[PDB]
UniProtKB/Swiss-Prot annotation:
It comes from Bradyrhizobium diazoefficiens (strain JCM 10833 / BCRC 13528 / IAM 13628 / NBRC 14792 / USDA 110). It catalyses: (S,S)-tartrate = oxaloacetate + H2O. GO terms for molecular function: D(-)-tartrate dehydratase activity; hydro-lyase activity; magnesium ion binding. The gene is tarD. The active site is at K169, H307. Catalyzes the dehydration of D-tartrate to oxaloacetate. Its cofactor is Mg(2+). PANTHER family: D(-)-TARTRATE DEHYDRATASE, D-GALACTONATE DEHYDRATASE-RELATED. This is D(-)-tartrate dehydratase. The record marks N44, K167, E326 as: Transition state stabilizer. It is an enzyme of class 4 (lyase). Homooctamer; tetramer of dimers. The record marks D277 as: Increases basicity of active site His.
Amino acid sequence: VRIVDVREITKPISSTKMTTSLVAVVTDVVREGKRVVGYGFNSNGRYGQGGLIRERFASRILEADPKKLLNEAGDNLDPDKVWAAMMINEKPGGHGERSVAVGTIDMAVWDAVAKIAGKPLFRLLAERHGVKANPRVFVYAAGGYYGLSMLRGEMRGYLDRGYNVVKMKIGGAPIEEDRMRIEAVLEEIGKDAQLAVDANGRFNLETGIAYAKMLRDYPLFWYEEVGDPLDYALQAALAEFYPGPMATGENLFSHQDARNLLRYGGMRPDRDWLQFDCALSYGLCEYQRTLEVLKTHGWSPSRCIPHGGHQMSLNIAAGLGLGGNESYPDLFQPYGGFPDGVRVENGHITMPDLPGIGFEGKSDLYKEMKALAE
Ligand SMILES: [Mg+2]
């Protein structure tokens, strides 16, 4: 059991200059007459880090003594050992681009590890955590970008796709104009679904409070990322004006930053949502440390709905008992989406028992991966 290679390729994202970096972790382990290769990539929103992967991380893994990257029985790779190996010579703090680089590699390490074990990643994770996995995952549709009729049509399209929770953007127009967009969508979906709004961290305290007063008059699913991701005091101050659920975290990339959010964000453990993106935040090895941080603060992993609409998110959700996943209908293909055949029904999908992350089960995506390394 050894990692023979680490291939990477970067390309623009499908339809401003956003990119996706795909990685391949090749091993010497063979399964059912075939070399096991792990694949991984970065969620949308942040630039692919194929550069750092090549320049710094990839070599550390290869130049590492294999006999030191194995589990106890030495019959498989130890994800944490590999993680620690690629993180040598890295100073504390500065959780930005490198978190995306490591997260993409980590995705591949786990994909391979699960394949070598011969089971679905979510099944393996549940096992490692001493519990049974729940293949049924709640998934909401994220969109509502920047008239009212077209917005309505967008949301209606999601409902006719099986979604019962949709999210739209706010803060990109005057507060009264957004009220119009919100009432429009609320009328369109009626009793068939719930609506979430996302400010994308645009608001300062006063604007956040102003929107809170407008938003609280509506039965919203949640109010997301009101201000700067690191302005914990601002988030804590919002509780006074908004009893309803709030969400944030997609732009915090370390367990240290997550710990600070729980210490100083004044969020409500019984109804708020944490959106840390596993893929963008040093990967699953790090996400598990973030979950321990949740525990130390009395939060349940069920409060997590990771940013990033892809199979890795689906696996960690079903595998770690998370609150759900997000999906961007028809976007970021072929990386985003579900395995071929699975569809959204009453706001949920059911994970098929595919080995590893399940990429091989999404033709359009796998063709991309084998074309990189096989
Ligand atoms: Mg968001």
